[PDB]
Every structure is written in C-alpha cells, then in structure tokens.
From TrEMBL, chain D:
It comes from Homo sapiens. This is Nuclear receptor coactivator 1. It comes from the Eukaryota. Belongs to the SRC/p160 nuclear receptor coactivator family. Nuclear receptor coactivator that directly binds nuclear receptors and stimulates the transcriptional activities in a hormone-dependent fashion. Involved in the coactivation of different nuclear receptors, such as for steroids (PGR, GR and ER), retinoids (RXRs), thyroid hormone (TRs) and prostanoids (PPARs). Also involved in coactivation mediated by STAT3, STAT5A, STAT5B and STAT6 transcription factors. Displays histone acetyltransferase activity toward H3 and H4; the relevance of such activity remains however unclear.
Length: 210, 219, 8, 11
C-alpha cells in the first residue's frame, strides 16, 4: 500500500458545558493540524489545499475523535481537557437535541461495533481527503488519496475482522450521520458567535469566519 | 461470488425502477415563473414515483406505521437529487439545466448542485446502482424522529451486500467504486440540511409548493 | 394531511 | 484569511 494504516494509526496514538466544549475544541484544533501533517501524503499537497481540507473537515474530525474517546463513559462525553459533559448538563444548556444525536449516532455505534483506533484514524483520513471541498487546486489527487485510504481500510478489515463482511460498509455508513451532526454543530456555533453567548477562543473563531 | 438469493431479489427491485415512468407528448408545457411551475410538477410527480418505489422494499410495510412516514420525509430530498443526477447525465435532459438556472434559486445553491451532478456522472452508475443506492438512502436509520432504528438497520444490511458484489462484477477496474457511492451518501446530507433554506430563499410568483411538497417539507 | 393516504 | 492555520502548517 502507499497509504499504510500504520502511519495513520501512529497519528492517532501521537495525539457552562458549551463554554467547556468550545475550549476543548480550540485546544484540539492545534493538535488536529499536527495530526493531519502526520497523515501520509497530506503534507505533500499545496498549502492552499491543506488549508481548504482542514477548514472543511475540522468539525467532523474533532467530533469523531471525542466520540471515540467517550465510549467508556455513561451517557456523556469526555472532553480533551479531561472534563466530562453529561446528557443532563447538555439539556440544561439548550443543546440537548444535538448532544443526543452524538451519543446515539456516534458514541453508541462506535461502542457497539467496537471501532478501534486504526479504524477511527482511517475514517478521519477519509474525512480529511474530501475531494468535494470547494476551491481545491487539484480535486483529482485528493480523490486519489481518499481512494488509497478506502483501499487500505478495506484490507485492514478483511484481515483483522474476517468474521463480518458488512463491516467495511458499516464503518463508512457513520460518515453521513457525522456530516449531518457536523452541520448542526456549525449552525449552533455561528449562532453562539452571533449573539456573543459564549467565549470563542482564537483558533476556533478563525475556523468560523469565511 | 453472486449472492444467496442472487439476481432474484434485485430483479424484483428493478421492476419498481421499470415502473419508473414519464409518458408524455414531449411535455407540451420559457420564463422563471413557468420554469418554477414545471419543476414543481416534476418534483410532485417524482414524490409519487418514490412513494411507490418504497412500499415494495423488503420489510418496509411491516415496520412501524408512524416511523414509516418519517423515512420518506427525511429521504425524499436525497432521492430527488439522485434522480436529477441521473436525468442530467444523458443525451437520449440538457435543457433541464436551463430550468433550474432560471427558476429563482438563490445563487449559492447553483454551483454546488451542478458540481454534485458532475461527481455523480463520473461514477458510471447503471440502473441497478441507481435503484439500490436510492433504496439505501430511503432506508437510512439516522433520520429525525424514529424509535425503531435497529429494525431499519436490518432491512438495509443485505442491500449493502448486494451492492458490494454488484460493484465488483460491473466495475472491477475501479475497485473502490463500491465505497465511492457511499461517499456520495455523505455528500447528499449537505443538500438535505440546506433544503429548508433553499426553499425558503426561493424567488417565485407569490405562490407556494403544491400541498404535498408543503407537507413533506413542512410550512 | 396526505400522510396515511399514501400507504393505502 | 486564516493566519493561525497557515502558520501551524509551516512545518
Ligand atoms: C419544489 C421544487 C421547486 C424543487 O425544489 N427543490 C428541488 C430540487 C430537488 Cl428536490 C433536488 C435537486 C434539485 C432541485 Cl432544484 C425542486 C425540483 O426537483 C426535481 C426536479 C426534477 C426532477 C426530475 C425527475 C425526472 C425527469 C424525467 C424522468 C424521470 C423518471 O421518472 O425517471 C424523473 C426531480 Cl426527481 C426533482
Ligand atoms: C458537540 C457539540 C458541539 C460541537 C462543537 C465541536 C465541533 C467541538 C469539538 C471538539 C471537542 C469538544 C473536544 C475534543 O475533541 O476533545 C456544540 C458546541 C456546537 C453544541 C454541543 C454539542
């Protein structure tokens, strides 16, 4: 393979509740860039394209990471700073609806299929190599890199989990739900910026302009 | 190898896409108003087509009488985008484009829309692939307002299995053609999210989406 | 209003 | 438009 899954996994290994969540997002935005640089072939792309891919995917990439990290906890989410947020804090803050979708469409499904870190890292790399991002200099080579992750992930799943054929599909069919959840989170965040509700720190603010 | 029930189950499905129907006298029916009315009439009719396609999917009619309705509201947009992509990529269609351009669609929704149509028409889909992918879209368990999710999930499963074997058999040369279709599912979600707005930011002739569309998409 | 009128 | 992100991608 040209997109080995070992260097994907190595990237994973290497790295008010709305206020706390936003704070953790800002923190993880710095570490997200470091993750992406470690993904085979991403750092090779033109800078402008690197910028485009991360601005398009950041919200989904981060939601995927904390969702996986939160398999262990009972009705709730482990933030990167170490604080938990639980369904009750979530609902008492006016964001229960979206918090519930995260728990049910992401955390629970990751837990009930027992996604591992290689699988997470690959899914995140697919999200990163989104060839439909507006303004890419060369859509074709991002498509080509996605296709390499798809091929490497499929051969990881046949090899490691040969008891289940509908498992490559099962993993990929978390991505549409991640996109709908991600769009709803962005909606909220533009709305949190708009009224000044919550303090949005520097890097997170940058991801929310145009 | 080909599936346990094989072609039999896919041929039962494809006769709903045989019932895929558009008889006309070259559609007798030029202006942004007129173009809008034509598109509305096509959308309403494709709603009817889609409702028929749904009842014949394995296990559909059995499952819960309310959550039944929910899937159609949640998926109809995506099915209509897929269908439009199919329509738009043909020579026999070409001036379908002119109607969508001059229909008062707020300018932002143009370019992404025609870009998605292009990504679809680079994937060399085939009826079976359109039919199956549409069925997969409809039986998505992760839509708003549902209690019987696990049950939806089980009806969906064997469709993925059939689709995977079909994309090896038909398109072995692009091996990941199977997974690439799934990545169009992801991208359909961006259109489903924006649609309530697109409709709302739609410049018309002081009218409204014909009663069925007003219901399926509310207000 | 046409909700249940399409399953019949 | 994206100063932090440009700088961090320098490496
Ligand atoms: C309410 C109305 C103003 C409207 O608001 N959004 C869209 C909208 C959607 Cl919902 C999605 C993508 C883009 C767009 Cl603008 C619309 C028109 O939507 C259409 C338009 C045309 C078709 C053609 C189907 C066809 C043609 C020939 C043959 C056949 C056939 O039966 O095979 C089927 C379909 Cl399905 C849906
Ligand atoms: C989920 C969620 C939201 C999304 C914010 C995002 C996208 C944060 C991502 C990363 C975090 C929180 C930490 C980490 O990865 O450790 C908002 C605030 C809109 C509403 C409540 C639920």
């Amino acid at each position: 393979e040209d997109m080995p899954v070992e260097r994907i996994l190595e990237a994973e290994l290497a790295v008010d509740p709305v206020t706390n969540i936003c704070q953790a997002a800002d923190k993880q935005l710095f570490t997200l860039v470091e993750w992406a640089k470690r993904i085979p072939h991403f750092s090779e792309l033109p800078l402008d394209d690197q910028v485009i891919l991360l601005r398009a995917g950041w919200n989904e990439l981060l939601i995927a990471s904390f969702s996986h990290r939160s398999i262990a906890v009972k009705d709730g989410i482990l933030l990167a700073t170490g604080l938990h947020v639980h369904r009750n804090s979530a609902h008492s803050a006016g964001v229960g609806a979206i918090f519930d979708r995260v728990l049910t469409e992401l955390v629970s499904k990751m837990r009930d299929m027992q996604m591992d870190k290689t699988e997470l890292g690959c899914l995140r790399a697919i999200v990163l190599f989104n060839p439909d991002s507006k303004g890419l200099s060369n859509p074709a080579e991002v498509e080509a890199l996605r296709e390499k992750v798809y091929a490497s992930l499929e051969a990881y799943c046949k090899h490691k989990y040969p008891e289940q054929p509908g498992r490559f599909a099962k993993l990929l069919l978390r991505l549409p739900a991640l996109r709908s959840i991600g769009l709803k989170c962005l909606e909220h965040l533009f709305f949190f910026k708009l009224i000044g509700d919550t303090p949005i720190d520097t890097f997170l603010m940058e991801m929310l302009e145009a | 190898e080909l599936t346990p029930d094989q072609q039999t189950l896919l041929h039962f499905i494809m006769d709903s896409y045989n019932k895929q129907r558009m008889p006309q006298e070259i559609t007798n029916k030029f202006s942004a108003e007129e173009n809008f009315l034509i598109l509305t009439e096509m959308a309403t009719n494709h709603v009817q087509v889609l409702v028929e396609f749904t009842k014949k999917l394995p296990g559909f009619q059995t499952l819960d009488h309310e959550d039944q309705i929910a899937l159609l509201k949640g998926s109809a947009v995506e099915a209509m985008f897929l269908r439009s992509a199919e329509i738009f990529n043909k020579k026999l269609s070409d001036l379908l484009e002119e109607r969508i351009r001059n229909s008062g669609i707020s300018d932002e929704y143009i370019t992404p829309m025609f870009s998605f149509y292009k990504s679809i028409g680079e994937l060399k889909m085939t009826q079976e692939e359109y039919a199956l992918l549409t069925a997969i879209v409809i039986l998505s368990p992760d839509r708003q307002y549902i209690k019987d999710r696990e049950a939806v999930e089980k009806l969906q499963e064997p469709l993925l299995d059939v689709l995977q074997k079909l994309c090896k058999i038909h398109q072995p040369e692009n091996p990941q053609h199977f997974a690439e279709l799934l990545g169009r599912l992801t991208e359909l979600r961006t259109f489903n999210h924006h649609h309530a707005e697109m409709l709302m930011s739609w410049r018309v002739n002081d009218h409204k989406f014909t009663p069925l569309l007003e219901e399926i998409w509310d207000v | 209003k046409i909700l249940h009128r399409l399953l019949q």
